[PDB]
């Protein structure tokens, strides 16, 4: 259970980098690092589920889309994003995993 | 005698044995149940072939080779059990069981309330 996609996020990469250092730089038990990441996967999921309010709206040109193995990938170009403020992005990559 | 039968016997016959239940087994066992309520009688009517439906006065009834009858309706309440647990759909049905011949001049037929000239319009000799 729990997808590992959130490890690619800013907070996820940071965690990876921290752990990698404790392993290499130090002598801190690897494998435990994996245990930690398994915890991360679950936490980010419940937190994003129970601790969020924002509603986003993304409108733009669909440059590319794709589906395989319960994962949708989209690349939106020249888009305006609305938070609940209006932000503009030249290129946005979206990766979505099945909710079911 | 016929009037008493219409007022009392239909209600009692339907009431006496109405309740029927289905016993459903699963592996959890289950029941389905259907009851019959207050029965409803109509005034005499006719169903034409096309489906138009209209009242029937006896004169025409004779001429057209018809049967002089009123429809019957029943209140069906359906229930389901799961075992006495009770869920079910009720009220909302009034169900047509069939037609009942109606004796002339009885309380049900249209003529019983008619007056003299009234009868003359319908052409039934007083």
């Amino acid at each position: 259970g729990y997808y590992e996609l959130y490890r690619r996020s800013t907070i996820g990469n940071s965690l990876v980098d921290a752990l990698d250092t404790l392993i290499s730089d130090g002598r801190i038990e690897a494998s435990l690092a994996m245990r930690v990441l398994e915890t991360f996967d679950k936490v980010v999921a419940e937190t994003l589920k129970d601790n969020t309010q924002s509603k986003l709206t993304v409108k733009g040109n669909l440059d590319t889309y794709g589906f395989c193995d319960d994962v949708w990938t989209f690349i939106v170009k020249n888009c305006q994003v609305t938070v609940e403020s209006v932000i503009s992005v030249d290129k946005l990559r979206i990766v979505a995993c099945n909710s079911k | 005698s016929f009037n008493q039968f219409v007022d009392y016997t239909l209600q009692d016959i339907i009431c006496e044995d109405s309740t029927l239940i289905l016993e459903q087994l699963a592996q959890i066992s289950r029941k389905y149940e259907i009851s019959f309520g207050k029965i409803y009688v109509t005034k005499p009517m006719v169903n034409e072939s096309d489906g138009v439906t209209h009242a029937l006065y006896p004169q025409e009834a004779r001429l057209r080779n018809l049967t002089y009858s009123s429809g019957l309706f029943v209140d069906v309440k359906k229930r389901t059990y799961e075992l006495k647990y009770e869920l079910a759909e009720e009220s909302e049905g009034k169900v047509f069981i069939g037609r009942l011949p109606i004796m002339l001049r009885s309380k049900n037929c249209y003529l019983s309330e008619a007056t003299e000239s009234d009868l003359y319009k319908l052409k039934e000799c007083p």
Binding site: A18, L19, L22, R35, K59, L62, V83 | -
Partner: protein, 92 residues
Amino acid sequence: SNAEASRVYEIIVESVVNEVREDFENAGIDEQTLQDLKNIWQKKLTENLMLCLYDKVTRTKARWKCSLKDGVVTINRNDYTFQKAQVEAEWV
């Protein structure tokens, strides 16, 4: 710029650390090592990618619509976290 994001991030760090502590204690590593992990992770944390779940994706002609849920995005160096998101994009 988003505040909910930083709050979510805080919840994640605090929540993960406390949970991980058992394993950390089991592996007989060090409470202060756990503390280091926390401080480095938070230190590192200080390219327009959205990671989330999809409820529904539809299309009619070249018009696509997507109902996204529980996600996190980095747009122009800023991070947003959301409960729901709707995507309306036109393919050619």
